[PDB]
Amino acid sequence: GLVPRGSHMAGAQDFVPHTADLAELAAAAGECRGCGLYRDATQAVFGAGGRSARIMMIGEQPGDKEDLAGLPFVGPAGRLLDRALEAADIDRDALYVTNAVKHFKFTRAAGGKRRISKTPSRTEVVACRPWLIAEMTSVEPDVVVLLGATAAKALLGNDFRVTQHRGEVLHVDDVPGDPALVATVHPSSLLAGPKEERESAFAGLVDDLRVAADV
Ligand code: SF4
């Protein structure tokens, strides 16, 4: 064909430039129309960090605060994650942090105090995955921490259950570079609930971060 058929016809793939440079990738994501989420979001929120990072962390999506900060993990969940990283003795300079989808999907409720996140469909996750693959091949992390169900399923499969594999180092044969994978609870889940449950859950997140950092 004058123009061939191929992966560039699906999802975000044709918006991803043939460069591993994270600044160029982030600039290009600002123009992505790979699914419908770019329309109502303020901006794309690419990952943050550098290519020497040994640990990559992936959440679900930018939330209300991130959508306007332009940066991942800035809101209350990000502050809880910072507390856990510090308890786990993990250097922020060793991290590249991002999300399975790069545009905030949301609604409002009258009387609300924030835009309410809505779950990306598996269709949206698969559409945005080209960016995640670009990030992973750019950074070459030794280990990927998957924060919550959307991010864990993005790499481990749509049937994967975070709740059934806590503490475990995983490897799957179609992830570029074959990094270790550790799936854990998303920090937003630890913000609410009875104290004893939040405290036990926090300790478990610190444990999983420490497993990842010991890879
Ligand atoms: S969520 Fe991902 S695939 Fe969809 S428009 Fe945004 S960057 Fe592109």
Author numbering: -7 to 207
The authors write:
UdgX excises uracil from uracil-containing DNA to concurrently form a covalent bond with the resulting AP-DNA.
The R184A mutation (motif B) supports the role of R184 in substrate-binding. H109S/R184A mutant showed nearly 2-fold increase in its Km as compared to H109S, and about 4-fold decrease in Kcat/Km. To understand this further, we determined the structure of H109S/R184A mutant and compared the R184A region of it with the structure of UdgX–DNA complex. These observations emphasise the role of R184 in binding of DNA substrate with UdgX. In addition, our biochemical and structural analysis of the R184 mutant shows that R184 is critical in binding to the DNA by establishing multiple interactions with the phosphate backbone in the neighbourhood of the uracil in the DNA.
